[PDB]
Design a protein around this ligand. Structure first.
Ligand SMILES: NC(=O)c1ccc[n+]([C@@H]2O[C@H](COP(=O)([O-])OP(=O)(O)OC[C@H]3O[C@@H](n4cnc5c(N)ncnc54)[C@H](O)[C@@H]3O)[C@@H](O)[C@H]2O)c1
Ligand SMILES: NC(=O)c1ccc[n+]([C@@H]2O[C@H](COP(=O)([O-])OP(=O)(O)OC[C@H]3O[C@@H](n4cnc5c(N)ncnc54)[C@H](O)[C@@H]3O)[C@@H](O)[C@H]2O)c1
Ligand SMILES: O=C(O)[C@@H](O)Cc1ccccc1
Ligand SMILES: O=C(O)[C@@H](O)Cc1ccccc1
Ligand SMILES: [K+]
Ligand SMILES: [K+]
Ligand SMILES: [K+]
Ligand SMILES: [K+]
Ligand code: NA
Lengths: 347, 348
């Protein structure tokens, strides 16, 4: 929206346009209160620049909250590269130039912003950024970074889901139906963990092959048009954000929402509807924090894989604290998590 | 539209919005090729944020060429603070917060951008910014800055003006009519320098007290509404930029255009029209470079006041070079100045 694009209250917006490639670059630093802003680089097509600015600010604000609630000593920021075509259609030379330009932008911020991988960006891309700028997390193990954080993200979402299911009074995942929307690196691992815990998995993915394989694995596919109308115990959004609009909130047929996607809730009204309908939502910025715990924990705090896994497991306890505030103060989980974030941040 | 203003080709755009004060902030770094970007902070009201961005971009690109052509080892940048209300209506607390936030933005750029005073900002404001960030030129002398660069700019414009009237075939300023639009810190000094050189001054300013003072000094007032229609030998825009639009360029009744205003020419066509009409224009980014020479020379290059003065006087020589390219190659002076900037940049 114009307001989210132009009247965003974050600390800083950085933009650049490269006529040659046709790409637009946006970096939004929401907060540097707890340390340098950090957040991944999302690369995607947007119908309008305002959309890219809007997304960047909402993602950057979620990162500030994620670091705060997760006890990580960093601020929140996010980069969005608005591509001139679908990522997959971008030629190598074009992609390379885009990364080079993005790295120059980050570099000018001189440590006030640290990037990482996100949608359509990977560790190889981090390595490429790193050929030009130091402020990059998520480089390959070979290049000095922590590599992939997907599994850690999946462990944390899985722990979140378990805590949420228990708090909702459903006991454990054994015997529950979990609908995973998105069979990516995180979604697929989450499906695996949940199935091992005894859940029956319903899966959806825009990639035919990904679905066919899950099915081959014993899971049941759900057609895209049926995702938001398929009954399940837990709805696990692991694909795009903004899934839960007011209308979706009103009609989702599940008891728990716990997934890996960022900015799951499209509006405040949606969150209140879920709450009113008895659908327990595990706040995205709390639930999917394993990625940030992995990268900041390992690269900034020097933690080993095992400690990072432990801390990701502790996302279940942070959620139990969130639900306790929610129940006590009578506010939605998202409000309670923001409250918890602020308390942990000593605000 | 934000959209089109976002289609700029410069190195970086920094923006911020402060709900509390309702101010918008823009820092545009056109280039960092020759050094960190540098340019003043202009504060004013804008109809739309897009205009502030557009303005910042044009001003930033002019700073790039200004440094290049003036042999200063810096890139070009510019800040624009889009005020929620008129400058004079802003309470001190609000102003103070606006400057604090601006300084925090500059600080994040960590030396890739250095600011200075410009429209509606002064040395005191520079000191204030400096309470938060190091990257500020133009601090008061007491705070370690070089103070006001207005007079140095005036000397440079005056030398530009002398070089231009001469090249135009009018002789010395003695006896010529010079119309100074804007009697501010620069314009007032230029009017005195010109008057001393024997010119007959016509002056205009929205500030009636300034006009009254000029009149007391023997100059002649021109009503604002008549500025662009007053015949003169030299038109010296020293107020706002964008005064010479295509339309004004066709009817301007003067032989020379030489002033202090940044971004004097509103459209490229206006540039072509003045050239075709035989009105010799001294490019803004060359002519008004005295302020930059003063700030960068004093604060970065370690030049004495005397050397700064000399460099500013040399703007006339720079112009002679510009006119020489324009004549030889058959291009407008603006184009010739850009060519010269590029050459100097490379040599340097
Ligand atoms: N990977 C991490 O460490 C991490 C950390 C935090 C948050 N997240 C979030 O988790 C989500 C997914 O992350 P990922 O790394 O696994 O991504 P991914 O690209 O590897 O996988 C996303 C998957 O979803 C599928 N998909 C896309 N749109 C879909 C739709 N409408 N319906 C169904 N499937 C669809 C894609 O084809 C793909 O298989 C994102 O929103 C991301 O921001 C990821
Ligand atoms: N001061 C420097 O060192 C410097 C250096 C380079 C470029 N410039 C440019 O030179 C111009 C003048 O700068 P300054 O420092 O003297 O500013 P200033 O604010 O001191 O003076 C501007 C003067 O113009 C008057 N004015 C405003 N609008 C007017 C209008 N529409 N018609 C007539 N008069 C009007 C103002 O009342 C004021 O007297 C600006 O465009 C500035 O960006 C200045
Ligand atoms: O939240 C995340 O998982 C992504 O923004 C990746 C990232 C995390 C932490 C720091 C930088 C980048
Ligand atoms: O051109 C000018 O005079 C102003 O932008 C002031 C300035 C010059 C150089 C560096 C910073 C600021
Ligand atoms: K740009
Ligand atoms: K990725
Ligand atoms: K169960
Ligand atoms: K000033
Ligand atoms: Na001021």
């Amino acid at each position: 929206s114009i307001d989210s694009a132009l009247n965003w209250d974050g600390e800083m917006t950085v933009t650049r346009f490269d006529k040659m490639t046709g790409a637009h670059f946006v970096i939004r630093l929401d907060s540097t209160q707890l340390g340098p802003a950090a957040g991944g680089t999302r690369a995607a097509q947007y119908s309008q620049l305002a959309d890219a600015l809007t997304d960047a600010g909402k993602l950057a604000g979620a990162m500030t909250l994620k670091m705060a609630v997760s006890n990580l000593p960093m601020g929140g920021g996010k980069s969005v590269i608005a591509l001139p075509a679908p990522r997959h259609s971008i030629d190598p030379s074009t992609w390379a130039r885009i990364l080079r330009i993005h790295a120059e932008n980050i570099d000018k911020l001189s440590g006030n912003y640290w990037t990482g991988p996100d949608v359509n960006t990977n560790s190889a891309d981090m390595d490429t950024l790193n050929d030009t700028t130091e402020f990059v997390f998520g480089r390959s193990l070979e290049r000095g970074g922590a590599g992939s954080s997907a599994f850690t993200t999946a462990v944390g979402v899985f722990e979140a889901m378990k805590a949420t299911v228990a708090h909702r009074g459903l006991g454990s995942l054994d015997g529950l139906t979990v609908l995973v929307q998105g069979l990516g690196a995180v979604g697929g691992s989450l499906a695996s963990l949940a199935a091992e815990a005894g859940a029956q998995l319903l899966v959806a993915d825009t990639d035919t092959e990904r679905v066919a394989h899950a099915v081959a694995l014993g899971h049941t596919a759900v057609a895209l048009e049926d995702v938001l109308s398929t009954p399940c115990d837990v709805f696990a959004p692991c694909a795009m954000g903004g899934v839960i609009t007011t209308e979706v909130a009103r009609t989702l047929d599940c008891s728990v929402v716990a997934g890996a996607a960022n900015n799951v809730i499209a509006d405040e009204a949606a969150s209140d509807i879920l709450h009113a309908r008895g659908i327990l939502y595990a706040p995205d910025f709390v639930a999917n924090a394993g990625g940030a715990i992995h990268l900041v924990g390992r690269e900034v705090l020097g933690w080993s894989e095992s400690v990072v896994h432990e801390r990701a497991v502790a996302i279940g306890d942070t959620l139990n604290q969130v639900f306790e505030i929610s129940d006590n103060d009578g506010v939605t989980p998202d409000e309670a998590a923001r409250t918890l974030a602020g308390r942990r941040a000593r605000e």
